């Protein structure tokens, strides 16, 4: 199967992409992180709540990876195994962007967890939906949404940087464009997928 993740700055396209695949006789598994199983979604809710006790940064990183571990076991690996295209909303790039760029944790700490949790499993293709920080935010606020501008700017820039450095694994789309244009960019990227598959 094929492991596709969708990323971008904080703030529809996925449904269009899935139906293009389904039309073409492909099984599609839609999912999201942190999340995607009952336990993982319990971890989600602890991560996103604007709780009176500030969550330590290492706690936040560990919980993102603990939800990822569960989801990989229960959802992602099984789907890949039966030949599904997984379209996962956010994955370890978001960890690099949010926890590394935004929060300031060392890229090295994230890399060591990525390897521990995932083995050699990486996304086959990562779609980065790029747009200006304040547009994204416009699209109640969770703990990450309540963040300051530099945090979001560092998120945006981390995604562009990671894509620049491994261009074969990433496509960056302009997500600020009108919807019809964004869908056309999705249609333009399908031949490559039918082919990685
Ligand atoms: C998958 C993932 C998501 N996030 C953030 C981005 C959203 O604000 C929120 C829910 F997806 O969690 C994050 O900070 N790190 C991650 O690894
Ligand atoms: Mg959000
Ligand atoms: Mg802040």
Curated annotation (Swiss-Prot):
Record's catalysed reaction(s): dTMP + ATP = dTDP + ADP
Pfam name, any one: Thymidylate_kin
One GO term of the biological process aspect: dUDP biosynthetic process
GO MF annotations, alphabetized: ATP binding; dTMP kinase activity
One cellular component (GO) term of this entry: cytoplasm
Signal peptide annotation: none
General function of this protein: Phosphorylation of dTMP to form dTDP in both de novo and salvage pathways of dTTP synthesis.
Annotated protein name in UniProt: Thymidylate kinase
Organism: Pseudomonas aeruginosa (strain ATCC 15692 / DSM 22644 / CIP 104116 / JCM 14847 / LMG 12228 / 1C / PRS 101 / PAO1)
Protein encoded by which gene: tmk
